[PDB]
Structures are given as structure tokens and as C-alpha cells.
Amino acid sequence: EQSICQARAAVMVYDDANKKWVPAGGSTGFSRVHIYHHTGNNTFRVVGRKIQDHQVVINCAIPKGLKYNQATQTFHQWRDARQVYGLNFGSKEDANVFASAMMHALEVL
């Protein structure tokens, strides 16, 4: 696996039942969020770990055809069959870096 980006974000998931975002992994705070490329089958994943205690709070596949919603310049989100994910980026620069790499992934899948 090769990291194609690193971006600072608080990783959220949406709790539909209570219509609230909650911190991924139950752990408030920022993570270092990568997109990793597995070249052997040209697959990509989003993997994020808490800056402080290194807990993996997101590890999801990026499917071909994903709709990546840039809701704001610092909060981007997407959904799959099971969950909705949000990234509250530490800065616009982080959001741009991540969105660049995500859009690249989605274009070569």
C-alpha cells in the first residue's frame, strides 16, 4: 500500500437514528487521514488514525462511482451502503489535498 495523500481531519460518522454526527471510533479529535493505493488490483482506501493515541478510526474502501460531496471548503462527506462519513478538515489546504487525491482515485478506478 502506498499513501497518495495525508490530511488532517476530524473523522465523523453519521448516526442516522439520532440525526447526529458522532466522532469516528468514539474518539473526539483530529486524525491523520490517508488514501492508500493498492497497486496490485488498483484499489484505494481511506485510513485515518488519531493523532494522539493512533487508534484507527476509519478504514473504508473507495468504490468506483463514489459521489464525493464537498459540502464546504473544510467538510467533505460520502456515503456507502452502510455508513455516511464526514471529514472536518483542519484547514482548507488539507481539504484540497485530500479532495485532489480522492478525485484522482475516482478517475483511475
Binding site: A10, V22, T28, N88
Partner: peptide
């Protein structure tokens, strides 16, 4: 929201 963050 700040309440969620």
C-alpha cells in the same frame, strides 16, 4: 455542529 465536535 460544535455540539457534535
Amino acid at each position: 455542529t460544535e455540539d457534535e465536535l
